[PDB]
Design a protein around this ligand. Structure first.
Ligand SMILES: [Cl-]
Ligand SMILES: [Mg+2]
Ligand SMILES: [Mg+2]
Ligand SMILES: [Mg+2]
Lengths: 124, 116
């Protein structure tokens, strides 16, 4: 299925709310705009800087536990109300990330989400 | 509700686990439909069902995706909302963590929570 992109979805308030965090995280990780857009709207691809950008966003958004790992309940609680059920179905077979570091774990989650629901998956 | 197919599938696991853990039938019904309570054998009964249902990982902790997949499809959505704030169990052993999950589910949706 093809990615949903319109005035209503992804939720504009969420996209604007993540702007400053994206700016922080692009500066820290050196990910290209092209890697982000391609991962969001195109085919899954694996780029090292993108993985740490993904991790960076979790950290800046304060959706991590006290060891720096993604806390999926905090993440759900943080998401827009309009995404409540979308996020639940997108995340339900992505509960236990695997990876040698937090960048790899963050990428595991995004890849799993994208695989699960390519229509509603997007990357800030 | 509960879905008939689940009641049927659970029966052989209940038999094994009541025998193994010594939990009382009354303890099960009390937890299922009444107030949350702690009974030691109940907690290990709960663990035993997860083990016998083969929904645990290599160290015996519940694999919540396996659990979800093992539930009747009619309970998919109910399970999802029960589970959404019950992801990271706490406890000193598998019985305490198994209880933690059941308590968390029961606290989240008492109307649809049951224990067989
Ligand atoms: Cl919710
Ligand atoms: Mg919310
Ligand atoms: Mg199911
Ligand atoms: Mg709750």
């Amino acid at each position: 299925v093809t990615p949903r992109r319109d005035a209503e979805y992804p939720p504009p308030e969420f996209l604007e709310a993540m702007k400053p965090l994206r700016e922080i995280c692009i500066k820290k990780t050196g990910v290209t705009e092209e890697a982000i857009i391609e991962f969001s709207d195109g085919k899954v691809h694996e780029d090292e800087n993108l993985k740490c950008y993904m991790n960076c966003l979790f950290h800046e958004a304060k959706v991590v536990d006290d060891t720096g790992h993604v806390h999926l309940e905090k993440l759900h609680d943080a998401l827009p109300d309009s995404m409540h059920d979308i996020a639940l179905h997108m995340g339900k077979r992505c509960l236990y990330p695997e990876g040698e570091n937090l960048c790899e774990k963050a990428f595991w989650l995004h890849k799993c989400w994208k695989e699960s629901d390519p229509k509603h998956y997007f990357l800030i």
